[PDB]
Design a protein around this nucleic acid. Sequence first.
DNA 1: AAAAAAAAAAAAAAAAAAAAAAAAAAAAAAAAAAAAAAA
Length: 210
Amino acid sequence: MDDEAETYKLWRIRKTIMQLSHDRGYLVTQDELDQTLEQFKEMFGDKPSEKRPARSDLIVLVAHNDDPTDQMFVFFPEEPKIGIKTIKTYCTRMQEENIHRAIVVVQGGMTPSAKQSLVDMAPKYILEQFLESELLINITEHELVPEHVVMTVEEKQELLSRYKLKENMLMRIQAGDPVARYFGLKRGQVVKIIRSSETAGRYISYRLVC
DNA sequence: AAAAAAAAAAAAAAAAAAAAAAAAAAAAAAAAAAAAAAA
């Protein structure tokens, strides 16, 4: 019962990770998005107890459409509580592969010293983290979550020039928001929210990531 | 007839329920530094 449930939750977490990577604009093929449970069992195995697949076997390397040298690692550590040793191992892998972006799918949580390592390591390499329970649901597919589109600096500048706005006068969204963590939004970006309206059909609002 | 002690009148004085945020204390795992055993 452990092997089948573990394979099912690993397949669901991998599907959510690949949908998250496709929503961020990274190069993801259609068969990876439409990968079934039986396809996952054929490709990676179905017995997670005897390392089929291993937790280090499910590492996901993905690249961006516009800039092919901007890539993401997705790590799947097997330890439930993550120390500084595995974080340092992943960081050394990031220097020796020259990649600035990675997401660590932790199981239980992280030590606060490792969180401080993520904080002060941040403006050279971005090292995000995600719980396993948070990645069992694609948040953007919920009926209460409208469409979120990340904007470039040109669209933000055009918005502030058109509406005569300053950046502090806009609405705000926290950096710890599940949608902002899903899209990987850093501080200063502006997210465009397109929602359905019952009086005008649809409505576009703008929020500043703080 | 002048001086002193006790009694009474006049004047100042002090004596209810709910809910959220912040502070605190025991605990508890983690991580860096110091001492000991062995090759």
